Amino acid sequence: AFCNLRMCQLSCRSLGLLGKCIGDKCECVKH
């Protein structure tokens, strides 16, 4: 749906990471 990239980025970014938001769910690449 609207996999919310802003939230995903934030939550990932808390772990340093680069949030990118897949169909189902948020993921977090490193670089």
Cα 13 from chain centroid (whole Å): 8
In angstroms, rounded to a whole number, what is the distance separating the alpha carbons of residues 30 and 26?
13
In angstroms, rounded to a whole number, what is the distance separating the alpha carbons of residues 6 and 13?
10
**Burial of residue 6, with CB atoms counted within 10 A of its CB: 0-12 exposed, 13-18 middle, 19 or more buried:** exposed
Name the strand (E) or helix (H) holding 18.
Answer: strand 18-21
In angstroms, rounded to a whole number, what is the distance separating the alpha carbons of residues 24 and 4?
11
In angstroms, rounded to a whole number, what is the distance separating the alpha carbons of residues 20 and 14?
14
Q: 28: which strand partners?
A: 19
Task: Report whether 18 contacts 1 (CB < 8 A).
Answer: no
Q: What 3-state class would DSSP assign to 6?
A: helix
Closest CA to 9 of 23, 25, 28, 24: 28
**Burial of residue 8, with CB atoms counted within 10 A of its CB: 0-12 exposed, 13-18 middle, 19 or more buried:** buried
Q: What 3-state class would DSSP assign to 26?
A: strand
